């Protein structure tokens, strides 16, 4: 059902920051191959972005 | 198994093919076509016929 | 002239008897041909067809 | 330049077997005594239906059900096919294919999951091989005990495929149309009343209830059905349709104004002749929405009979007319979970109108639970304007005035019986599907120049007489300006967007900023929102009739059952017949095969083309001898 | 224009004095025009979604005349 | 280079059949060649 989807997707998203660091340290690990999947990779793409912008959203409120 | 409705008779369908030749023929024996009510009718036979079966009084 | 020689290159039976890869073939003449359209301005319909025609083989072949 | 290039006996016996040649193919044949492909060398004998040749090479199964040659198959039968067989989709060979016995394995495990790990195009194309076999009207009707059940099985089945299977969404749709015209087809060959029914009542109105779900809205349509159903919910008062207009209006507003009678005197004596006036659907429909009709009165009625005293009493106890909007309230939600309890969740929640009994129920319980507790707790008399913003006698009247918009709004279902307004209103409710995909790109633009906004004014509302530059400071403001700028009725002036002090630049720049938010939305996508109606319109007005009858029929069904008699108010108040449907059934199915072939078979071009292959036969024969 | 502005102020004014075209204002208006092309760029990404990206297209596609 | 020419090869040969039959929708033109047939019986004879 699509709420598992988005549930999925959200955990995803807000793990990017570690699937990244890991797969900077060693894409050898698993780790580091498991962002290599474009679909993951779109995801943290994504949120990357969004984070972005929520970050632009908290300087207009001074 | 009756191809055709118990009701339908033979000036009846020639009416319903429209073939002219046909229809002239059997004219000729001087047919008749039972006439119908009016269209809010309240007797006894349009009742009971109503009642009795619907879907072939409409029919 | 130049008409009648591109109708004859673009038939999907020509193309199918006597080309390497027909795909490839299909590809590059359908292109060439929309190329085309846009510089004989009279003409552009017929060129458009010849292209829509070639693209459509192309997915009838891959369709197999 | 380009050069193109492309990248004895048997030839005799080819060449012979092509065009009607039988004995100097038996010469051929005495010649080999003493394969080839231009094939058997009998393929081409098969599709040329020559028999008599055939039979003399004989002394390609599958080519010759793909010609639908009859004779050839026999012959070659006498000297899987049937998947073939019934995707042609006729009789003749399909039964006598069948005669032998034929199993085929149903479609679904983790040995199929390794197959498709080696090929999944394969996989999937015989899966709709055999769904496709499966759906064909001659196969159902030869194999299958209950053809119409069947039917409305398969065709809900096939639906759910194409949902799961994305790419073959086209070829599955198309599947279950072809099901569900054939059990409309089926029905259509009832004759009389006796017949009909026979069919819509057997049990495996069990048929009719079936058909409203899995959506047959085809099958509902049919004269045959909606002639039943007219009869069923007008019952014993069939002569209402012979009333004149005038006369008709007359007796739905008495059977109305009398509502609480009528439902007084089922009550004491329900087997009476005005206790049995509820029993009909027709009348059990206009006493209930009399019923509703008061409760809207009562409604209308609570602020003419306010006492203005009471407008600065902090603690006001129950009126009388509040104890009357309580029964009724727990009248409406006792009716509630009854259709709930006896349906079941996805059923109830699926309607639109029971929805909205949802939410307006749940606001009328909180605005008089709070209106307990504040009379117990804050009695205090003090005047209007001195009271807290979040007073609990203030929030207790915003959660009314909020449910008596939801209370009016549910009167959209009954504009489903009329015959005029029905048809436009099922109309409306399916171009509300295109405005919430608008919705979604909206909502970003909004939140776009919502951003920059707040942070070009911040540094440096609208609901007041001289509007001000007030409502670009927050988040919330800002996001209110914006909305008013859709309508282009000027709700909101220019001079908002002027700095207090100066800033001559920055007072510039954000004006650039609103004019553009203008166009992008009044401009663009305003006029883009208004193509799509104009096109999905036209391909739903294609439908209007068939959609507005399934939808009338569902409402009318909900009324026949006698779970639900009383009106809201009272309601808190304390083998034989298999057999018959099987002779219908072989009738019906007869009948069908009768009428299908008069449909195709009217150009009659086969029957002089057939004369024409006898005299070609017996010309060939003259010479030969 | 944020360091172009640094680097030739060092000490505080009142606002309201400020000629229009000094470089802060320029920073924020530019600053601000930024966020709001920033937060457009999400509509390349409708084209993921079944229901949005149709949609997408069609008013790409419509845009020319 | 060898696997591309072979699936071409059936490729086109199932191209060539599938047209023909998809314009036999429109192929009544059976009796003509039993003309055809009744000719080549005649040059049998003669
Ligand atoms: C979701 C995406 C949808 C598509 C988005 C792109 C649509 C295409 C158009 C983009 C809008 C571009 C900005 C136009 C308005 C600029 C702001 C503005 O003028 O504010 C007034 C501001 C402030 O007073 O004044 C100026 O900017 C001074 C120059 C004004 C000159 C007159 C207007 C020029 C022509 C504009 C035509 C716009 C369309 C009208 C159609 C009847
Ligand atoms: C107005 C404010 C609240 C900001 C709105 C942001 C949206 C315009 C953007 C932000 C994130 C986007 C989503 C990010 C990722 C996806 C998943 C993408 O699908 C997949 O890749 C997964 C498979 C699927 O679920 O279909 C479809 C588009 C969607 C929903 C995007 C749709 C547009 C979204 C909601
Ligand atoms: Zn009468």
Same mark, same amino acid.
């Given at each position: 059902?699509?709420?598992?989807?988005?549930?999925?997707?959200?955990?995803? $998203?807000?793990?990017?920051?570690?699937?990244?660091?890991?797969?900077?340290?060693?894409?050898?690990?698993?780790?580091?191959?498991?962002?290599?999947?474009?679909?993951?990779?779109?995801? =943290?793409?994504?949120?990357?972005?969004?984070?972005?912008?929520?970050?632009?959203?908290?300087?207009?409120?001074? | 198994?009756?191809?055709?409705?118990?009701?339908?008779?033979?000036?009846?369908?020639?009416?319903?093919?429209?073939?002219?030749?046909?229809?002239?023929?059997?004219?000729?024996?001087?047919?008749?076509?039972?006439?119908?009510?009016?269209?809010?009718?309240?007797?006894?036979?349009?009742?009971?016929?109503?009642?009795?079966? !619907?879907?072939?009084?409409?029919? | 002239?130049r008409l009648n020689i591109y109708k004859a290159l673009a038939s999907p039976s020509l193309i199918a008897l006597s080309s390497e890869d027909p795909i490839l073939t299909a590809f590059r003449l359908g292109?060439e041909l929309?190329?085309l359209?846009?510089?004989?301005?009279?003409?552009?319909?017929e060129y458009e067809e010849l292209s829509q025609q070639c693209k459509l083989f192309a997915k009838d072949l891959?369709?197999? | 330049?380009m050069a193109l290039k492309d990248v004895?006996?048997?030839?005799?016996?080819?060449?012979?077997?092509?065009?009607?040649?039988?004995?100097?193919?038996?010469?051929?044949?005495?010649?080999?005594? !003493?394969? =080839?492909?231009?094939?058997?060398?009998?393929?081409?004998?098969?599709?040329?239906?020559?028999?008599?040749?055939?039979?003399?090479?004989?002394?390609?199964?599958?080519?010759?059900?793909?010609?639908?040659?009859?004779?050839?198959?026999?012959?070659?039968?006498?000297?899987?096919?049937?998947?073939?067989?019934?995707?042609?989709?006729?009789?003749?060979?399909?039964?006598?294919?069948?005669?032998?016995?034929?199993?085929?394995?149903?479609? @679904?495990?983790?040995? =199929?999951?390794?197959?498709?790990?080696?090929?999944?195009?394969?996989?999937?194309?015989?899966?709709?091989?055999?769904?496709?076999?499966?759906?064909?009207?001659?196969?159902?009707?030869?194999?299958?005990?209950?053809?119409?059940?069947?039917?409305?099985?398969?065709?809900?089945?096939?639906?759910?495929?194409?949902?799961?299977?994305?790419?073959?969404?086209?070829?599955?749709?198309?599947?279950?149309?072809?099901?569900?015209?054939?059990?409309?087809?089926?029905?259509?060959?009832?004759?009389?009343?006796?017949?009909?029914?026979?069919?819509?009542? @057997?049990?495996?109105?069990?048929?009719?209830?079936?058909?409203?779900?899995?959506? #047959?809205?085809?099958?509902?349509?049919?004269?045959?059905?909606?002639?039943?159903?007219?009869?069923?919910?007008?019952?014993?008062?069939?002569?209402?349709?012979?009333?004149?207009?005038?006369?008709?209006?007359?007796?739905?507003?008495?059977?109305?104004?009398?509502?609480?009678?009528?439902?007084?005197?089922?009550?004491?004596?329900?087997?009476?002749?005005?206790?049995?006036?509820?029993?009909? /659907?027709?009348?059990?429909?206009?006493?209930?929405?009399?019923?509703?009709?008061?409760?809207?009165?009562?409604?209308?009625?609570?602020?003419?009979?306010?006492?203005?005293?009471?407008?600065?009493?902090?603690?006001?106890?129950?009126?009388?007319?509040?104890?009357?909007?309580?029964?009724?309230?727990?009248?409406?939600?006792?009716?509630?979970?009854?259709?709930?309890?006896?349906?079941?969740?996805?059923?109830?929640?699926?309607?639109?109108?029971?929805?909205?009994?949802?939410?307006?129920?749940?606001?009328?319980?909180?605005?008089?639970?709070?209106?307990?507790?504040?009379?117990?707790?804050?009695?205090?008399?003090?005047?209007?304007?001195?009271?807290?913003?979040?007073?609990?006698?203030?929030?207790?009247?915003?959660?009314?005035?909020?449910?008596?918009?939801?209370?009016?709004?549910?009167?959209?279902?009954?504009?489903?019986?009329?015959?005029?307004?029905?048809?436009? #209103?099922?109309?409306? $409710?399916?171009?509300?599907?295109?405005?919430?995909?608008?919705? $979604?790109?909206?909502?970003?633009?909004?939140?776009?120049?919502?951003?920059?906004?707040?942070?070009?004014?911040?540094?440096?509302?609208?609901?007041?007489?001289?509007?001000?530059?007030?409502?670009?400071?927050?988040?919330?403001?800002?996001?209110?300006?914006?909305?008013?700028?859709?309508?282009?009725?000027?709700?909101?002036?220019?001079?908002?967007?002027?700095?207090?002090?100066?800033?001559?630049?920055?007072?510039?720049?954000?004006?650039?900023?609103?004019?553009?938010?203008?166009?992008?939305?009044?401009?663009?996508?305003?006029?883009?929102?208004?193509?799509?109606?104009?096109?999905?319109?036209?391909?739903?007005?294609?439908?209007?009739?068939?959609?507005?009858?399934?939808?009338?029929?569902?409402?009318?069904?909900?009324?026949?059952?006698?779970?639900?008699?009383?009106?809201? /108010?009272?309601?808190?108040?304390?083998?034989?017949?298999?057999?018959?449907?099987?002779?219908?059934?072989?009738?019906?199915?007869?009948?069908?095969?009768?009428?299908?072939?008069?449909?195709? #078979?009217?150009?009659?071009?086969?029957?002089?083309?057939?004369?024409?292959?006898?005299?070609?036969?017996?010309?060939?024969?003259?010479?030969?001898? | 224009?944020?360091?172009?502005?640094?680097?030739?102020?060092?000490? !505080?004014?009142?606002?309201?004095?400020?000629?229009?075209? @000094?470089?802060?204002?320029?920073?924020?208006?530019?600053?601000?025009?930024?966020?709001?092309?920033?937060?457009?760029?999400?509509?390349?990404?409708?084209?993921?979604?079944?229901?949005?990206?149709?949609?997408?297209?069609?008013?790409?596609?419509?845009?020319?005349? | 280079?060898?696997?591309?020419?072979?699936?071409?090869?059936?490729?086109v040969?199932?191209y060539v059949?599938a047209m023909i039959?998809?314009s036999?929708?429109?192929?009544?033109?059976?009796?003509?060649?039993?003309?055809?047939?009744?000719?080549?019986?005649?040059?049998?004879?003669?």
């Amino acid at each position: 059902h699509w709420v598992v989807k988005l549930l999925t997707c959200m955990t995803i $998203g807000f793990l990017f920051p570690m699937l990244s660091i890991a797969y900077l340290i060693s894409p050898r690990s698993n780790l580091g191959l498991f962002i290599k999947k474009p679909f993951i990779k779109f995801i =943290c793409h994504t949120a990357s972005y969004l984070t972005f912008l929520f970050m632009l959203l908290l300087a207009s409120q001074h | 198994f009756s191809e055709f409705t118990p009701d339908i008779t033979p000036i009846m369908l020639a009416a319903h093919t429209n073939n002219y030749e046909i229809i002239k023929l059997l004219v000729q024996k001087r047919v008749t076509i039972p006439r119908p009510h009016q269209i809010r009718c309240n007797c006894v036979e349009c009742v009971s016929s109503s009642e009795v079966d !619907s879907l072939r009084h409409s029919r | 002239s130049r008409l009648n020689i591109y109708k004859a290159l673009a038939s999907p039976s020509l193309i199918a008897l006597s080309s390497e890869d027909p795909i490839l073939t299909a590809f590059r003449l359908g292109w060439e041909l929309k190329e085309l359209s846009k510089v004989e301005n009279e003409f552009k319909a017929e060129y458009e067809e010849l292209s829509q025609q070639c693209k459509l083989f192309a997915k009838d072949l891959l369709d197999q | 330049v380009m050069a193109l290039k492309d990248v004895l006996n048997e030839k005799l016996f080819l060449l012979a077997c092509d065009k009607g040649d039988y004995y100097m193919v038996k010469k051929i044949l005495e010649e080999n005594s !003493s394969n =080839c492909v231009d094939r058997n060398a009998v393929t081409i004998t098969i599709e040329n239906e020559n028999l008599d040749i055939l039979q003399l090479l004989l002394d390609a199964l599958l080519v010759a059900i793909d010609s639908e040659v009859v004779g050839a198959v026999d012959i070659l039968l006498n000297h899987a096919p049937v998947i073939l067989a019934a995707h042609r989709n006729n009789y003749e060979i399909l039964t006598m294919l069948l005669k032998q016995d034929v199993s085929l394995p149903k479609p @679904h495990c983790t040995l =199929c999951s390794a197959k498709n790990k080696k090929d999944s195009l394969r996989h999937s194309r015989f899966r709709l091989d055999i769904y496709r076999c499966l759906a064909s009207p001659a196969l159902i009707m030869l194999t299958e005990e209950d053809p119409i059940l069947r039917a409305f099985e398969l065709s809900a089945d096939l639906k759910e495929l194409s949902l799961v299977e994305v790419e073959f969404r086209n070829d599955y749709e198309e599947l279950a149309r072809q099901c569900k015209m054939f059990a409309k087809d089926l029905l259509a060959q009832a004759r009389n009343s006796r017949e009909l029914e026979v069919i819509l009542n @057997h049990t495996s109105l069990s048929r009719l209830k079936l058909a409203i779900k899995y959506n #047959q809205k085809e099958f509902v349509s049919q004269s045959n059905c909606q002639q039943f159903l007219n009869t069923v919910w007008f019952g014993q008062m069939s002569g209402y349709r012979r009333k004149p207009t005038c006369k008709k209006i007359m007796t739905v507003l008495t059977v109305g104004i009398f509502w609480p009678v009528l439902s007084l005197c089922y009550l004491i004596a329900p087997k009476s002749q005005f206790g049995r006036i509820i029993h009909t /659907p027709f009348m059990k429909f206009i006493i209930h929405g009399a019923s509703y009709f008061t409760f809207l009165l009562l409604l209308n009625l609570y602020s003419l009979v306010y006492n203005e005293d009471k407008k600065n009493t902090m603690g006001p106890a129950l009126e009388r007319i509040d104890y009357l909007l309580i029964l009724w309230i727990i009248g409406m939600i006792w009716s509630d979970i009854k259709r709930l309890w006896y349906e079941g969740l996805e059923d109830f929640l699926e309607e639109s109108r029971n929805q909205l009994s949802f939410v307006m129920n749940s606001l009328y319980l909180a605005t008089f639970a709070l209106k307990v507790v504040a009379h117990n707790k804050f009695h205090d008399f003090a005047d209007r304007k001195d009271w807290d913003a979040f007073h609990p006698t203030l929030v207790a009247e915003g959660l009314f005035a909020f449910a008596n918009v939801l209370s009016y709004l549910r009167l959209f279902f009954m504009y489903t019986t009329s015959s005029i307004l029905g048809p436009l #209103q099922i109309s409306m $409710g399916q171009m509300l599907q295109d405005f919430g995909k608008f919705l $979604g790109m909206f909502l970003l633009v909004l939140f776009s120049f919502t951003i920059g906004l707040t942070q070009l004014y911040d540094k440096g509302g609208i609901f007041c007489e001289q509007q001000s530059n007030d409502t670009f400071h927050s988040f919330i403001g800002t996001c209110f300006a914006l909305f008013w700028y859709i309508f282009s009725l000027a709700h909101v002036a220019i001079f908002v967007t002027r700095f207090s002090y100066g800033e001559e630049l920055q007072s510039f720049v954000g004006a650039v900023i609103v004019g553009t938010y203008n166009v992008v939305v009044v401009i663009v996508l305003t006029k883009l929102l208004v193509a799509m109606l104009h096109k999905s319109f036209q391909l739903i007005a294609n439908h209007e009739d068939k959609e507005w009858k399934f939808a009338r029929a569902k409402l009318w069904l909900s009324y026949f059952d006698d779970k639900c008699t009383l009106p809201p /108010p009272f309601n808190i108040i304390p083998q034989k017949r298999d057999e018959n449907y099987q002779k219908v059934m072989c009738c019906l199915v007869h009948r069908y095969l009768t009428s299908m072939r008069q449909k195709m #078979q009217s150009t009659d071009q086969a029957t002089v083309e057939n004369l024409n292959e006898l005299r070609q036969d017996l010309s060939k024969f003259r010479n030969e001898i | 224009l944020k360091i172009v502005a640094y680097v030739k102020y060092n000490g !505080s004014r009142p606002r309201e004095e400020w000629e229009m075209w @000094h470089p802060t204002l320029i920073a924020e208006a530019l600053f601000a025009i930024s966020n709001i092309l920033s937060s457009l760029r999400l509509i390349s990404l409708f084209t993921a979604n079944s229901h949005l990206g149709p949609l997408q297209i069609s008013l790409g596609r419509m845009l020319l005349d | 280079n060898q696997h591309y020419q072979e699936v071409i090869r059936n490729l086109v040969k199932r191209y060539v059949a599938a047209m023909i039959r998809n314009s036999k929708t429109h192929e009544g033109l059976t009796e003509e060649n039993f003309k055809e047939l009744k000719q080549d019986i005649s040059s049998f004879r003669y």
